[PDB]
Amino acid sequence: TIPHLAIDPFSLDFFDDPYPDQQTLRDAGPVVYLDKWNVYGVARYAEVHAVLNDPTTFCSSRGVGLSDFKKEKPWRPPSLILEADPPAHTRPRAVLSKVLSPATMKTIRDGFAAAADAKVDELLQRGCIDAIADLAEAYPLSVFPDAMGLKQEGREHLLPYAGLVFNAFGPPNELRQTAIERSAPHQAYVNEQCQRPNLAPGGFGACIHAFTDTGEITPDEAPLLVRSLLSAGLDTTVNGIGAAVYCLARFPGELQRLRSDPTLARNAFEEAVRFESPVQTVFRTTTREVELGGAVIGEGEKVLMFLGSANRDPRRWSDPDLYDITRKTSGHVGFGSGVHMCVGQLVARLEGEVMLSALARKVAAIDIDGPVKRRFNNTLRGLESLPVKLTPA
Numbered sequence: 255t256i257p258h259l260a261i262d263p264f265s266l267d268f269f270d271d272p273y274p275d276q277q278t279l280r281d282a283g284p285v286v287y288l289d290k291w292n293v294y295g296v297a298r299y300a301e302v303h304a305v306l307n308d309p310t311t312f313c314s315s316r317g318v319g320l321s322d323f324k325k326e327k328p329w330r331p332p333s334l335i336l337e338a339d340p341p342a343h344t345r346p347r348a349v350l351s352k353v354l355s356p357a358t359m360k361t362i363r364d365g366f367a368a369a370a371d372a373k374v375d376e377l378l379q380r381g382c383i384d385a386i387a388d389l390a391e392a393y394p395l396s397v398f399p400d401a402m403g404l405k406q407e408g409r410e411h412l413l414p415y416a417g418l419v420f421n422a423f424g425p426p427n428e429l430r431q432t433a434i435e436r437s438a439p440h441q442a443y444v445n446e447q448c449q450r451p452n453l454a455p456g457g458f459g460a461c462i463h464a465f466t467d468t469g470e471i472t473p474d475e476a477p478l479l480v481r482s483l484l485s486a487g488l489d490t491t492v493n494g495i496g497a498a499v500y501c502l503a504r505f506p507g508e509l510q511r512l513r514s515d516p517t518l519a520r521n522a523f524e525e526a527v528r529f530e531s532p533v534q535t536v537f538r539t540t541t542r543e544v545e546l547g548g549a550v551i552g553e554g555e556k557v558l559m560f561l562g563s564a565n566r567d568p569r570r571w572s573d574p575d576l577y578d579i580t581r582k583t584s585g586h587v588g589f590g591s592g593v594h595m596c597v598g599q600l601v602a603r604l605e606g607e608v609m610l611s612a613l614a615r616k617v618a619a620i621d622i623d624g625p626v627k628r629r630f631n632n633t634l635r636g637l638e639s640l641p642v643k644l645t646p647a
C-alpha cells in the first residue's frame with residue numbers, strides 16, 4: 255500500500271538539486287516510506303498541512319528531528335517550545351509571542367530599516383560583493399545580536415551554533431556527526447549568554463527574563479527560551495534574505511517590478527520564503543495508530559514533512575517553480591502551520607521587508623558575476639557564496 259523509496263533526502267546530491275526527487279516523492283503517493291532512514295514521508299501540500307495541524311497525533315515532544323527522544327538522549331536539553339506539546343507548550347509560546355510582539359516590532363523597526371539602508375549604501379560603494387557574507391549574513395548580524403542584548407565578544411559563535419542545531423535535526427550522517435564533534439565551544443558560549451546578567455536591558459533576552467513572574471514561565475525556564483532565539487533567530491533569516499537576493503538575481507523582471515513599487519517588498523520576501531523554503535524539513539512522532547492519506551501509520555513512528563516540496567506542490571500552487579512577487583503567498587508552510595508556526599515570523603518578515611525595500615529603492619540591477627556555491631545542511635537550504643555586481647539606481 256505505502257510505496258517504499260530509496261531516496262535519501264539528507265544526501266548531498268539531494269541538497270544540490272532537490273526538485274526532481276521532491277516530485278518523485280509527491281507523485282509516488284500521499285504517504286511514502288523512506289527505507290534509508292525508516293521514516294514515513296509526506297511531500298504534498300495537503301498532507302504536510304494536515305500533519306502540522308494535528309499536534310495531538312503528530313507530536314513534537316519526542317523531537318522534531320530524526321532522533322526519537324523516547325529512544326535516544328537528545329543532544330542538548332529539549333527546547334521548551336519547539337520540542338514541547340500542548341499544554342506544556344502553551345505558556346512558553348505565549349511569552350515568546352509577547353516578547354516578539356507587534357509593540358516590540360514598532361520599537362525596533364526604524365533602527366532595523368536604517369541598518370538595512372546603510373548596508374546597501376555600503377555595498378554600492380564596493381560594486382562587486384558576495385551577497386551571502388556581505389549581505390545575507392552581514393545584515394542580520396548587524397541588527398539581531400544587538401536586538402537580543404548580546405555583548406560584542408563571542409558573536410562569532412552564533413552562526414556555527416545555529417548550523418549545528420539544524421544539522422542535529424537530521425539523521426546521524428557525516429554532516430550531523432561532524433557538527434556535534436565541533437559543538438562544545440559554541441554550546442558553551444550560547445548557554446552562558448542565556449543567563450540574565452549577560453543580556454542587555456531592553457533586549458529580547460532581558461524581556462524573556464522579565465516575564466518570569468507572571469505565572470507563565472519560571473526563572474529557570476528563561477535561559478532555555480533565550481536559547482531558542484539564539485538557535486532559530488539568526489541563521490534562518492540569513493538564508494531567507496539570501497533566498498530573496500538569489501531570486502531577484504535570477505529573475506530580473508521581478509527586481510524590475512519591485513523597484514517600480516517598493517511596497518511589494520514584504521510579499522517579495524514572503525514569496526522567497528515559499529520559493530526556497532530555508533527550513534526544508536521538520537519531523538513529528540505519531541502518538542497512536544493513525545490513518546493519513548490512506549496509510550495506516552502505527553504508534554511511535556517518525557514522520558518527515560517536506561516543507562519545501564509542499565511549497566512547490568502543483569496541486570496547491572499555480573506555476574510553483576516561478577518566483578512571483580505578487581503571488582498570493584498566504585498558506586505557504588515555510589514558517590510552519592498551526593500551534594508551532596514560527597513565533598519569530600514578525601522579526602523575520604521585518605528584516606526581509608526592510609532589506610528588500612532598501613534594494614528596491616537603491617539598486618538598479620543585481621547580476622551574478624562569479625561562481626555560485628551552495629551550503630549543505632541537513633535542515634537548512636541556502637548558499638555559501640553568491641557573487642553579484644550591484645548597479646546603483
Ligand code: HEM
Pocket residue numbers: 314318335336337347350354482483486487488490491493494527531532533536587588589590591593594595596597598599601602
Ligand atoms: C525566514 C526565517 C525563518 C524561517 C523560514 C523559520 C521557520 C520556522 C518553522 C518552519 C518553524 C516551525 C517548526 C515546527 O513546526 O516544528 C519555526 C518555529 C520557530 N521559530 Fe522560526 N523561522 C524563521 C525565523 C525565526 C526567527 C527570526 C526567530 C526568532 C527571533 C524564530 C524562532 C522560532 C521559534 C522559537 C520557533 C518555535 C515555535 C514553536 O515551537 O511554537 N524563527 N520557524
Ligand SMILES: CCCc1ccc(C(=O)O)cc1
Pocket residue numbers: 318333334335336337419481482483485486533536
Ligand atoms: C525547527 C524550526 C527552527 C527552530 C530551531 C530551534 C528552535 C529552538 O531551539 O527552540 C526553534 C525553532
Ligand SMILES: [Cl-]
Pocket residue numbers: 330441444
Ligand atoms: Cl546547546
